Scaffold this motif. Structure first.
Motif, mmCIF file in Angstrom:
data_model
loop_
_atom_site.group_PDB
_atom_site.id
_atom_site.type_symbol
_atom_site.label_atom_id
_atom_site.label_comp_id
_atom_site.label_asym_id
_atom_site.label_seq_id
_atom_site.Cartn_x
_atom_site.Cartn_y
_atom_site.Cartn_z
ATOM 1 N N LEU D 41 33.827 -12.272 32.495
ATOM 2 C CA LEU D 41 32.424 -12.374 32.411
ATOM 3 C C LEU D 41 32.010 -13.037 31.027
ATOM 4 O O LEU D 41 32.811 -13.335 30.253
ATOM 5 C CB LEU D 41 31.875 -11.046 32.337
ATOM 6 C CG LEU D 41 31.696 -10.329 33.865
ATOM 7 C CD1 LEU D 41 30.943 -9.076 33.790
ATOM 8 C CD2 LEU D 41 30.746 -11.270 34.626
ATOM 9 N N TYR D 42 30.820 -13.024 30.724
ATOM 10 C CA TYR D 42 30.333 -13.823 29.478
ATOM 11 C C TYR D 42 29.134 -13.091 29.164
ATOM 12 O O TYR D 42 28.015 -13.051 30.080
ATOM 13 C CB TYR D 42 30.105 -15.295 29.688
ATOM 14 C CG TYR D 42 31.257 -16.285 29.569
ATOM 15 C CD1 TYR D 42 31.819 -16.341 28.564
ATOM 16 C CD2 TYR D 42 32.056 -16.657 30.935
ATOM 17 C CE1 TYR D 42 33.112 -17.122 28.395
ATOM 18 C CE2 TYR D 42 33.054 -17.254 31.013
ATOM 19 C CZ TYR D 42 33.684 -17.536 29.715
ATOM 20 O OH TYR D 42 34.963 -18.264 29.775
ATOM 21 N N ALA D 43 28.808 -12.710 27.930
ATOM 22 C CA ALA D 43 27.767 -11.953 27.203
ATOM 23 C C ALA D 43 27.519 -12.602 25.981
ATOM 24 O O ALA D 43 28.261 -12.629 24.831
ATOM 25 C CB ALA D 43 27.861 -10.604 27.289
ATOM 26 N N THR D 44 26.226 -12.710 25.757
ATOM 27 C CA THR D 44 25.914 -13.472 24.221
ATOM 28 C C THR D 44 24.665 -12.538 23.998
ATOM 29 O O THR D 44 23.699 -12.049 24.296
ATOM 30 C CB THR D 44 25.027 -14.569 24.666
ATOM 31 O OG1 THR D 44 25.900 -15.808 25.224
ATOM 32 C CG2 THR D 44 24.660 -15.438 23.075
ATOM 33 N N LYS D 75 25.847 -24.199 18.242
ATOM 34 C CA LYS D 75 24.501 -24.721 18.445
ATOM 35 C C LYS D 75 23.359 -23.694 17.843
ATOM 36 O O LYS D 75 22.440 -24.138 17.231
ATOM 37 C CB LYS D 75 23.982 -25.176 19.809
ATOM 38 C CG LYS D 75 25.064 -26.276 20.613
ATOM 39 C CD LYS D 75 24.665 -26.360 21.979
ATOM 40 C CE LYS D 75 24.577 -25.208 22.863
ATOM 41 N NZ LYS D 75 24.401 -25.383 24.281
ATOM 42 N N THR D 76 23.506 -22.521 18.248
ATOM 43 C CA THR D 76 22.702 -21.646 17.813
ATOM 44 C C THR D 76 23.172 -20.434 16.970
ATOM 45 O O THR D 76 22.362 -19.696 16.340
ATOM 46 C CB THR D 76 21.600 -20.660 18.943
ATOM 47 O OG1 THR D 76 21.941 -21.774 20.127
ATOM 48 C CG2 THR D 76 20.311 -20.446 18.680
ATOM 49 N N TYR D 77 24.526 -20.335 16.607
ATOM 50 C CA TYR D 77 25.099 -19.453 15.994
ATOM 51 C C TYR D 77 25.034 -18.040 16.535
ATOM 52 O O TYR D 77 24.437 -17.217 15.712
ATOM 53 C CB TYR D 77 24.933 -19.483 14.596
ATOM 54 C CG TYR D 77 25.691 -20.567 13.718
ATOM 55 C CD1 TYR D 77 26.814 -21.183 14.269
ATOM 56 C CD2 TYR D 77 25.125 -21.181 12.529
ATOM 57 C CE1 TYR D 77 27.663 -22.125 13.514
ATOM 58 C CE2 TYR D 77 26.064 -22.029 11.660
ATOM 59 C CZ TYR D 77 27.025 -22.474 12.299
ATOM 60 O OH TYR D 77 27.756 -23.578 11.763
ATOM 61 N N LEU D 78 25.272 -17.784 17.800
ATOM 62 C CA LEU D 78 25.148 -16.595 18.506
ATOM 63 C C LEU D 78 26.647 -16.157 19.051
ATOM 64 O O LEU D 78 27.333 -16.916 19.573
ATOM 65 C CB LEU D 78 24.207 -16.531 19.517
ATOM 66 C CG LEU D 78 22.738 -16.106 19.142
ATOM 67 C CD1 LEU D 78 21.954 -17.073 18.402
ATOM 68 C CD2 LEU D 78 21.896 -15.959 20.547
ATOM 69 N N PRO D 79 26.867 -14.917 18.588
ATOM 70 C CA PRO D 79 28.249 -14.448 19.334
ATOM 71 C C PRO D 79 28.371 -14.500 20.882
ATOM 72 O O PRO D 79 27.445 -13.801 21.345
ATOM 73 C CB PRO D 79 28.406 -13.295 18.611
ATOM 74 C CG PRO D 79 27.003 -12.617 18.451
ATOM 75 C CD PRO D 79 26.297 -13.780 18.123
ATOM 76 N N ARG D 80 29.287 -14.811 21.451
ATOM 77 C CA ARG D 80 29.797 -14.792 22.770
ATOM 78 C C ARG D 80 30.728 -14.067 23.170
ATOM 79 O O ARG D 80 32.010 -14.516 22.700
ATOM 80 C CB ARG D 80 29.561 -16.467 23.252
ATOM 81 C CG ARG D 80 29.520 -16.124 24.767
ATOM 82 C CD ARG D 80 29.504 -17.753 25.477
ATOM 83 N NE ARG D 80 29.345 -17.771 26.895
ATOM 84 C CZ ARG D 80 28.270 -18.082 27.478
ATOM 85 N NH1 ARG D 80 27.136 -18.174 26.528
ATOM 86 N NH2 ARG D 80 28.101 -18.097 28.725
ATOM 87 N N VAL D 81 30.687 -12.874 23.738
ATOM 88 C CA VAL D 81 31.976 -12.154 24.057
ATOM 89 C C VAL D 81 32.205 -12.493 25.454
ATOM 90 O O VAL D 81 31.343 -12.878 26.413
ATOM 91 C CB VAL D 81 31.643 -10.941 23.788
ATOM 92 C CG1 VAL D 81 31.169 -10.413 22.363
ATOM 93 C CG2 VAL D 81 30.530 -10.108 24.817
ATOM 94 N N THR D 82 33.396 -11.707 25.870
ATOM 95 C CA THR D 82 34.099 -11.761 27.097
ATOM 96 C C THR D 82 34.345 -10.469 27.604
ATOM 97 O O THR D 82 34.598 -9.670 27.021
ATOM 98 C CB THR D 82 35.075 -12.813 27.456
ATOM 99 O OG1 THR D 82 35.610 -12.551 28.715
ATOM 100 C CG2 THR D 82 36.011 -12.749 26.709
ATOM 101 N N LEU D 83 34.201 -10.344 28.822
ATOM 102 C CA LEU D 83 34.824 -8.979 29.870
ATOM 103 C C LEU D 83 35.968 -9.347 30.623
ATOM 104 O O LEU D 83 35.843 -10.242 31.209
ATOM 105 C CB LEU D 83 33.676 -8.136 30.196
ATOM 106 C CG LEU D 83 32.420 -8.126 29.536
ATOM 107 C CD1 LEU D 83 31.217 -7.447 30.152
ATOM 108 C CD2 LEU D 83 32.353 -7.406 28.240
ATOM 109 N N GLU D 84 36.833 -8.155 30.802
ATOM 110 C CA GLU D 84 37.729 -8.017 31.748
ATOM 111 C C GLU D 84 37.623 -6.989 32.568
ATOM 112 O O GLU D 84 38.119 -5.721 32.342
ATOM 113 C CB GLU D 84 38.965 -7.921 30.836
ATOM 114 C CG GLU D 84 39.628 -9.620 30.631
ATOM 115 C CD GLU D 84 38.906 -10.044 29.538
ATOM 116 O OE1 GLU D 84 38.419 -9.214 28.458
ATOM 117 O OE2 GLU D 84 38.872 -11.401 29.293
#
Lengths: 259, 149, 140, 146, 259, 144, 55
Positions: D41-44, D75-84
């Motif tokens: 997954l992807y979450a910002t 581009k916006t300096y926002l952290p993007r995490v991933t899930l398993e």
């Protein structure tokens, strides 16, 4: 693969039973016998100088060197915790439960346990134990029996010297530059210390750590090839066997009477 | 073979271990007497013990006068019954007392604090006396929800 | 004394006594019933949690499950068979031992007007106190 | 022979102790005995706080997955995490407000999901837009006093 | 009493200065000579089998037991603050700071350090080093130079096996016996994210405690009485001198790196 | 020398010490890359740094990109100046950004949090932002 | 804020049950008025306290 694969492993199992079978037979004849009380009375004092007195120098100078490192490393882990008054539950509790009869037994096998094996090995190459059989006396009751009772009463006595100097060694590194007083360090040490909990249980595990160390030092000194290489091979053999008998029994003695 | 030298160093080694035993029993340990002076068991009921464990010290006015032997549970009334151990020196405890379990500091253990009461010009406490003026312990799950409501 | 004749039997007897001091001493130095309670948010609760009625520990928790149709946490606790007659109108009200300790299950007593046997489900639960949305209501 | 009779009898008995005590050392400490990991997954967010690698995510109090790595946006300096998340739980709605909660008073945090009523299923390749940043201890002290 | 009491002190003051005189002169004439890399290339693998490979039967099988007692004794003492989260904190921090290069040094000097003294001392009894001195080959480069380098690079290679047997040895009580697998145990183990602490300082103490052990192990074996009693006397004095060199220098190495 | 069994067991010991290093250093210590560090140094002037120590991590939105090499103090204005480092992989910072020395909960170490005039280079100066908070500021402003 | 003495022992009363706390100071400090009051302040988070004078 399968037929010749057991030719190297099955032969070692026969000599293993003959090795442990001779250690229990030697200790049974050295203890159960004639109650020589007046004859063995100067023999216990002679075998207490090279076991209790000559091995007292190493444990005293290492008692201050086991508290000044434990008390200094224990100060940084308790930083930013507001628990500087609870130093007595770390330097005095770990020296009585974890340390104590474990570290002092490793130093007993190097100074007193290693020299006890080489003493009988030097007398076996010169056949001094075989000359006692010609004098109509028991060789297992004259040269082995005063050396077993002198080692079983010295290591519980040397354990208390390792604890009390190590407690004072933790107080030496405690109030040295930290600015703490002598009222907060001896306040948390009195808690959870009573009868049959920490002081008695340290003496319980100490005498078990004294029989298993002196049993190997008297067996390998009695079972050795009388030559120049057999004494040096059995001298280093007792240090490895006592390192696995003290640390190997640490997991057994922790499951009973936790603390 | 010299008995004049070996007998001296044995007594030095024996006094080095005797002085080491007095350093771990008087400075490290706070036990001096090995007497067996008995006490009387006092029964008291509560509704919530909180974090009360075994061998907890009981105090009356701040000074520790005993401990707790064990704690049982009533199979009929479903209430915890706590036993007490009070020395037989002087009690003077009336029937208008208030038992309240308290704690020491913020991360400390729990202890029983006995509060004395007044008497009118009320009987004397005996072995097995029970009262109902006991204060229950408090937890963090009840004071936070009552503060916002 | 004699090789291959007497030294074997002493080594067998010594191994029968040394292994006896590591079997009954090292190793090992209950009819219970299970319950179910479907929650919504517990927090950081793990297995083997003490369950108490009034404060004294009487049972533990075997494991926690999760249904694939509702995704609600269900705790499968275990209590002793000696204590019975628990009303169904009493919630659990999970609290924390001490102030900085770990979480543990509780059960407060209720008022009487049935008997909860094995396989019963609690229909009235209570959510835990999470610091995420608790401190935000006082300011916002 | 005489020494060959006892060579084969006790030799299997020493291999009986070697065949024993090997099922207690090759114990099961994870799920990797059969299958390690059978979706990404992807979450910002805006500010994850003290979130580090290998952080457990929870749905209502039970652990369901980990966090592999955190990659910043260029581009916006926002952290993007991933899930398993495993394949046993997949029917999650898209209206879940993903918020970052805390765990204790030490400094560690953990991600928390919320289940409810419903849309579209969240599978691999999609990015959830209903996110919420974490809170810091220095923000509420300036809003309460002022 | 001014001349009779100081007469016996002069015999024990000059010989103590000559004790360290032959110890520093022997190590100096072993590495400043001609450099050969292909001549000692089969000799280094031979000495690495006795020091490093034969010492794996003591450190590995007992390193699990030291890791096991750090989980049992480290669980009941923290039953009121953190019984599952801080279980793997005191195990990985203590084994990488003071239990790594110190406790394994007593096991290294008991097997690979005590037998190294008896190996050199056996060559002087039957006149093996004197026969090699009678040729044009340097006797201080065939039994000293490949044997000193086989003990310097061996103890840091044996410390990491002692660390990996201690962290995994504490994992049998973490993931089993009423514990969590990886949620609260392994998450509190990577708190030391810096590469300077517990990685460089652990490797620095392992090299310093490796030179000071192999120096006394090669000094007592090179300076001994050529008889049956001189080899066994230097074997006992090696373990005593090495134990005070890893405990007396442990307070020295901690005061500048942990203070 | 039989050269049959002696040369094998040395290679097993040399291999067992290699896998034991990856169990500690690679698994539970760090990444242990080549660490070329192609970063650049900046300059930031604060008023009260609080409890900032050496090798303090700095993060943008929680993601740490570097540490603090050394902190100096000028004898002219007597203001603390931190020399932080930002790697070359993330160079898009504006000039209107503000820093915030925050804490990781209530017991962790103090770290710098940078939240969001094209870009900054070697030799620029960030504008003066707010400093950290102490116990005397919270207890003084609540009563007075 | 500077330590001057320690507490010897803790006694009790058999009639009114008031804990009398004794304390000794050295002869370096003796000019103490009668208006000074004792105060029990907390030191740390364990649960132990210490006496503090208020002259």
């Amino acid at each position: 693969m399968l037929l010749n694969a057991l030719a190297s492993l099955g032969h070692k199992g026969i000599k293993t039973l003959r090795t442990f079978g001779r250690a229990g037979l030697m200790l049974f004849n050295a203890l159960v016998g004639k109650p020589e009380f007046r004859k063995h009375a100067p023999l216990l004092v002679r075998q207490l100088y090279n076991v209790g007195v000559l091995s007292m120098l190493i444990i005293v100078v290492s008692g201050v060197f086991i508290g000044m490192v434990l008390g200094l490393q224990g100060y940084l882990v308790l930083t930013t915790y507001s628990a500087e008054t609870s130093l007595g539950m770390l330097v005095a509790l770990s020296l009585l439960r974890e340390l104590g009869p474990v570290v002092a037994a490793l130093l007993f096998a190097g100074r007193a346990g290693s020299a006890l094996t080489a003493e009988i090995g030097l007398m076996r190459a010169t056949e001094q134990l075989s000359s006692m059989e010609m004098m109509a006396v028991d060789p297992l009751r004259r040269v082995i029996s005063p050396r077993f009772w002198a080692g079983v009463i010295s290591l519980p006595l040397l354990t208390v010297i390792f604890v009390a100097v190590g407690i004072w060694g933790g107080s030496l590194v405690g109030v040295s530059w930290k600015g703490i007083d002598s009222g907060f360090f001896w306040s948390a040490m009195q808690n959870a210390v009573d009868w049959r909990m920490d002081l008695v249980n340290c003496l319980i595990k100490s005498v078990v750590f004294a029989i298993t160390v002196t049993w190997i030092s008297l067996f390998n000194g009695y079972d050795a090839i009388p030559t120049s290489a057999g004494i040096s091979r059995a001298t280093t053999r007792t240090v490895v066997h006592s390192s696995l008998a003290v640390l190997g029994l640490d997991f057994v003695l922790t499951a009973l009477m936790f603390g | 073979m010299q008995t004049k030298k070996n007998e001296i160093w044995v007594g030095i080694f024996l006094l080095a271990a005797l002085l080491a035993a007095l350093f771990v029993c008087l400075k490290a340990a706070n036990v001096t007497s090995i007497r067996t002076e008995p006490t009387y068991t006092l029964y008291a009921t509560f509704d919530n013990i909180g974090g009360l464990k075994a061998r907890s010290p009981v105090s009356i006015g701040g000074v520790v006068v005993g401990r707790v032997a064990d704690i049982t549970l009533d199979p009929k009334t479903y209430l915890p019954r706590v036993t007490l151990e009070i020395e037989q020196r002087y009690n003077h405890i009336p029937d208008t007392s208030s038992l309240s379990i308290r704690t020491s500091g913020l991360l400390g253990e729990q202890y029983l604090a006995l509060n004395v009461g007044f008497e009118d010009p009320t009987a004397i406490l005996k072995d097995g006396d029970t009262i109902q003026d006991t204060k229950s312990a408090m937890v963090l799950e009840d004071l936070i929800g009552q503060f916002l409501y």
